[PDB]
Amino acid sequence: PPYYAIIAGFHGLPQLSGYNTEDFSFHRFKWLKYANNVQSYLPPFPPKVEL
Amino acid sequence: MRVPININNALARVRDPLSIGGLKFPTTKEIQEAVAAIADKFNQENDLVDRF
Amino acid sequence: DKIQLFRTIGRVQYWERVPRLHAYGVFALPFPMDPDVEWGNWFAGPHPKAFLVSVHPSGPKAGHVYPTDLSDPDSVANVIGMVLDGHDYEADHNVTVTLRAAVPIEYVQQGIEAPPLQPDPAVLNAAPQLKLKVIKGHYFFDYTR
Amino acid sequence: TLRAAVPIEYVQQGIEAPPLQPDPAVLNAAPQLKLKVIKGHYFFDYTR
Amino acid sequence: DKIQLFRTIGRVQYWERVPRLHAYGVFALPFPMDPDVEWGNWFAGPHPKAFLVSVHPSGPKAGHVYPTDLSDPDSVANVIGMVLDGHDYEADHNVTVTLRAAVPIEYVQQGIEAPPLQPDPAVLNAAPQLKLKVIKGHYFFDYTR
Amino acid sequence: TWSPLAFKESRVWDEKEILYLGRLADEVQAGVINEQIAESLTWLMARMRNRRRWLTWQVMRTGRITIQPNDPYNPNGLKYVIDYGVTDIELPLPQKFDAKDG
């Protein structure tokens, strides 16, 4: 039964650069919820055309 | 007082040369070392009234 | 007592992994491990060892493997394969389970109180209902069937 | 096909069975059909 | 779990060596250590710590020193001094016992279940019959008299 | 310590469709699988780039890689909860900026 095959992959993970050596803490990025009603200032988008 | 140690020689020594993990054979790995010095920066001496 | 004559302060044994028949084939799929199992004394010892795992068919731990209880009939009925020369259980909790292989009978022990490099007689006794077959001192198994 | 390994979402018996979904009639009878479900796939060989 | 972020795997504390009065004088003589005493939990910890020893006056171990039992009236009556610094008990079994020194009360704890750097209230209670005198928060002892 | 993850995938084309498909308007002499493999070859390169950005953004958003058994594109059912060291990823703000009190 002749056939054909493709295999793809890799190995990996992300890693942070460097933590604080005094007390082991990392904060280079934080997230802030700055406002609630922001989509009232935003233009709408076209809907998804699905054939 | 400081503790009488080598900084260079303690980092190369605190690692087991005769230990294997859950894998029954020694694995490939990579090791980096870093040195920190901890001193209280905010305990300063009252140099004000030396001149008064 | 100021002499302190020679002693051995640490030993290291290194081995060759597990002999396996080239022609019979490999088939492996990794399953999650059970956190309720002390996996340390199952991956201890430098010597070659293989052991059977069973899967939980249901419950909150469904799809997790645990070493096969040969006195529990439902742990025998739920075998899924062997772990061969187990991995770093400390850095990862998902072990590759080999479902089809051919391994000599000297490398498979279930008990922690079972000597290395000997055939485990409890595996040989339960070998029909473990879906194992001993042919020329080798276990032949396949759990995809 | 007598020996293959197919995901369980592609196997539906009844015509009144939605496509791309698992079939609970097959999964209930998979032991006595000599099928075996391992990780969302059916393993079968009917030469044995 | 795959990373194991940061854990301290080794701790070393380095202290200073149990201050005493310069002017009161030092008089020390080595004694054989009792083999029936577990000396490993008397020399444990980096803390500046001193403790009393009593000598066996007679019997098969006459001349050997053991740490002072504060509840035994004979071990109290047979005190010979303090072990101030801390001895290499593994190699040698002959400890240098100070018979005359002047040591602050913060550094003398008898029991293993006694906090370091704090006065032991059992020693302060027993200081008359231990031939100790407390002056300015310091013990004054001379067991040559 | 640090140690990676693993992910790979496969695809097979059987014997019927290699020479039993052409176009749908005209007639073609069995050469369309060479056009359909080269897409699916290019598609799997995009899968590995799409997997990298997911794990990358999972740290940037929560600092916590989580992979559960019942999950999209985890048929194998594996378990990974990889906690990084991101301390206090959310800033506190009880009245946002457009509260307009009064």
* Whether the Cβ atoms of residue C87 and residue C96 lie closer than 8 Å to each other: yes
Q: What is the 3-state secondary structure (H, E, C) of E80-121?
A: EEEECCCCCCCCCCEEEEEEEEEEEHHHECCCCCCCCCCCCH
Q: Give residue F77's identity as a one-letter amino acid code.
A: G
Cβ neighbourhood burial of C31 (10 Å; 0-12, 13-18, 19+): buried
Give the resolution in Å. 2.8
Return the residue matching tokens 């020193």.
E65
**Spatial separation of the C-alpha atoms in residues C103 and F3, rounded to whole Å:** 30
> Residue C46: its chain B contacts at CB < 8 A?
20, 24
C-alpha closest to that of F10 among A4, C99, A1, B16? A4
The H or E element containing residue C139 is strand C138-142
The structure was resolved experimentally with: cryo-EM
The three-state secondary structure class of F46 is helix
Return the residue matching tokens 């140099």.
B47
For B22, the closest of C10, C14, C86 (CB atoms) is C86
CB–CB contact D7 F77 (8 Å): no
Q: What is the 3-state secondary structure (H, E, C) of chain D?
A: CCEEEEEHHHCCCCCCCCCCCCCHHHHHHCCCCCCEECCCEEEEECCC
**Spatial separation of the C-alpha atoms in residues A19 and A26, rounded to whole Å:** 5
State the best of E1, E2, E5, E6 to mutate against chain F, taking most chain F CBs within 10 Å.
Answer: E2
**Spatial separation of the C-alpha atoms in residues E124 and F25, rounded to whole Å:** 107
Question: For residue E144, how many other CB atoms are within 10 A of its CB?
Answer: 9
Cβ neighbourhood burial of E81 (10 Å; 0-12, 13-18, 19+): buried
Distance of CA F6 to the CA centre of its chain: 13
C-alpha closest to that of F57 among A14, C134, E71? A14
> Residue C31: its chain D contacts at CB < 8 A?
39
> Residue E1: its chain C contacts at CB < 8 A?
91, 93
**Spatial separation of the C-alpha atoms in residues B14 and B8, rounded to whole Å:** 11
User: In sequence order, which residues have a C-beta less than 8 Å from that of residue C50 and are 6 or more positions away?
Assistant: C18, C82, C83, C84, C85, C103, C107, C108
Strand pairing report for A4-12 and E133-135: unpaired
**Spatial separation of the C-alpha atoms in residues F83 and E3, rounded to whole Å:** 8
CA distance A6 to chain E (A): 30
